[PDB]
Amino acid sequence: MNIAELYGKMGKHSWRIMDAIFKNLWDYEYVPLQLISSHARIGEEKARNILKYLSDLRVVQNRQKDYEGSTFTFIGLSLYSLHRLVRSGKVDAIGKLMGEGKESAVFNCYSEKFGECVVKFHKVKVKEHFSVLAIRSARNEFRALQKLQGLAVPKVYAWEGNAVLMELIDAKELYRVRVENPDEVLDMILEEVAKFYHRGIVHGDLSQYNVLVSEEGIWIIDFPQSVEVGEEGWREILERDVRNIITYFSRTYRTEKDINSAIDRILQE
Numbered sequence: 001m002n003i004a005e006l007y008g009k010m011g012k013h014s015w016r017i018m019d020a021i022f023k024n025l026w027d028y029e030y031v032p033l034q035l036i037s038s039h040a041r042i043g044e045e046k047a048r049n050i051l052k053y054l055s056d057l058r059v060v061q062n063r064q065k066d067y068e069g070s071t072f073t074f075i076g077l078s079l080y081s082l083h084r085l086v087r088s089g090k091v092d093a094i095g096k097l098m099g100e101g102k103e104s105a106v107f108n109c110y111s112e113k114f115g116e117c118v119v120k121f122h123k124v125k126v127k128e129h130f131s132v133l134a135i136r137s138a139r140n141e142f143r144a145l146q147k148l149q150g151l152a153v154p155k156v157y158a159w160e161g162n163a164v165l166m167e168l169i170d171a172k173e174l175y176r177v178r179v180e181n182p183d184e185v186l187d188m189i190l191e192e193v194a195k196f197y198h199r200g201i202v203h204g205d206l207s208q209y210n211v212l213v214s215e216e217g218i219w220i221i222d223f224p225q226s227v228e229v230g231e232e233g234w235r236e237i238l239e240r241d242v243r244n245i246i247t248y249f250s251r252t253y254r255t256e257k258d259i260n261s262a263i264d265r266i267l268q269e
């Protein structure tokens with residue numbers, strides 16, 4: 001079942017039920033049936049039958065252990081975020097999956113206003129809340145992309161739920177390309193990192209999987225772990241980006257760049 005066919009199975013009542021979950025996510029993981037019903041203005045027994053069907057379609061997860069409650073699955077939060085995008089007129093048709101990992105699923109899509117785009121659906125103080133965390137990641141990526149506009153990153157078009165709509169870049173991940181000028185490519189990445197840093201942004205997950213390259217130049221993507229300069233740990237997070245990208249170039253190309261000196265250079269500007 002592709003996300004487009006799933007979308008086709010939803011009626012108005014289905015969307016209202018999902019809106020009622022979404023609007024109560026901040027105070028419950030599993031939103032009580034009574035509250036889904038009251039918010040949606042759908043009687044309890046009918047709301048219950050909707051949620052059972054949504055669960056059969058893997059859009060919600062229903063629990064009954066302590067009380068009758070429901071929350072989004074990944075697919076469901078994504079479907080609902082897509083809906084917000086369609087209703088807002090920013091997306092007209094979802095397209096094919098481009099790829100999926102542990103952190104996101106990225107789809108092709110078409111917008112009359114913005115052309116052929118990507119929509120990226122996000123997955124995933126006490127170290128040991130799926131939806132609120134995925135939505136927070138999405139918003140973080142959207143805000144970083146907005147702050148970076150004009151640099152070599154995708155243009156950003158919208159954020160709803162766990163979804164960020166952005167420009168399709170026609171370029172390959174660095175890790176799939178054998179560049180013949182690695183020293184110059186590494187310097188271009190490091191210069192872009194300095195530009196982010198001058199805008200008050202640290203990427204936070206820089207790697208060979210989110211530098212894109214073409215004959216035209218490089219682009220950088222993937223900002224859900226980004227932080228603002230002078231956030232807790234920002235400097236160490238920045239050093240890690242610089243060290244990690246330099247280390248990939250050392251392993252792959254035996255480039256000679258010194259990590260500590262590259263960091264001090266970016267930091268001094």
Ligand SMILES: Nc1ncnc2c1ncn2[C@@H]1O[C@H](COP(=O)(O)OP(=O)(O)NP(=O)(O)O)[C@@H](O)[C@H]1O
Nearest residue numbers: 101103104106118154167168169173209210221222
């Ligand atoms: N705007 C874009 N244009 C072209 N391809 C993109 C775009 N966003 C994502 N992709 C492709 O989809 C992949 C996954 O997106 P990405 O933003 O890196 O999320 P992630 O897979 O969840 N984290 P990671 O693999 O660590 O970079 C990329 O490595 C790109 O190959």
